[PDB]
Structure prediction request, 176 residues.
Amino acid sequence: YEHSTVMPNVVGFPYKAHIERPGYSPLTLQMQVVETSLEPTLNLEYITC
Amino acid sequence: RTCRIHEISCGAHSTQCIPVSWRCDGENDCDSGEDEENC
Amino acid sequence: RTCRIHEISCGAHSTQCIPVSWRCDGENDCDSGEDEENC
Amino acid sequence: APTIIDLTCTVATCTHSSDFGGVLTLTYKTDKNGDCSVHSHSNVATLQE
Ligand SMILES: [Ca+2]
Ligand SMILES: [Ca+2]
Prediction:
């Protein structure tokens, strides 16, 4: 079964997704982000001291 | 007890007549599972 | 007694079925609180 | 044969698939316990039992 949701990008927020699929009882899926990283790619120009 | 010949009784404190075909048919047809005892 | 395979019984005088998963999970679910005995 | 009166048929699940993908429940009141034979009077639905 395919499902798509959108969860906010905030650390610690408890997000809950509801899946309703015919023939079955609904499912609640909880999923939250515990940390995030964001690394740029770096080109070294020079070194100074 | 003392139900119709075509059926039995499956309780002592409580009365519950079940057909003889339900006696030892592989399923618990009574509140107390004494249909599937000592088959 | 003799409830659904999924659910176990928690009494002798009373009829009150509970899911197996409720058995020994740190909180009572039956008047005779034997869900949390012999863990 | 046990006597049945006030029969109501309500459908729990319904998916028009290849197997038996539909469920219906029957509410009734009977004088005595016994065996009854079910049937469906249209080819638009096929009963498993
Ligand atoms: Ca039986
Ligand atoms: Ca418990």
Q: What stands out?
A: Residues B 22, 25, 27-29, 35-36 surround calcium ion (ligand 1) (CB under 6 Å). Residues 11 and 32 of chain C are 7 Å apart (CA to CA).
